[PDB]
Amino acid sequence: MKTPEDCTGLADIREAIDRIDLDIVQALGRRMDYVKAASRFAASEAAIPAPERVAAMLPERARWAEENGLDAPFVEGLFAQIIHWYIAEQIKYWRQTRG
């Protein structure tokens, strides 16, 4: 596993990107564990989507993007897609655990 500067061709590059992508999938895997646990602190299925939390989360992620060398809008939009899939998945977990 080589740093960007030590990479001598695309195989080296793609070895590190595959690893990074797997970390992202693994992190998303762990995120679902916390999103499912979040369902226990929801009094109803309507209490889950929590729009104020989403709206405040998103500019928070956009800033982190900038602090990491990335244009914000795309990263904000990416997290918008992530958060909504997890919301729907939480409702699905709430429905099967609470009816």
Name the site residues for ligand SAL (rule: CB under 6 A).
17, 35, 38, 48-50, 53-54, 83, 86-87, 90
* Spatial CB neighbours of 94, under 8 Å, sequence gap ≥ 6: 39, 42, 45, 48
Among 9, 43, 44, 99, binds its own copies (CB under 8 A): 9
For the chain, report the end-to-end CA distance as a whole number of angstroms: 48
| Binding-residue pattern over the window 48 to 77 for its own copies, x denoting contact by CB under 8 A | -----x---x--xx--xx--xxxx--xx-x
* Spatial CB neighbours of 57, under 8 Å, sequence gap ≥ 6: 79, 83
95 binds its own copies (CB under 8 A): no
Do 83 and 54 touch, CB atoms closer than 8 A? yes
* Chain residues that interact with its own copies, rule: CB under 8 A: 4-5, 7, 9-10, 13-14, 16-18, 20-38, 41, 53, 57, 60-61, 64-65, 68-71, 74-75, 77-79, 81-82, 85
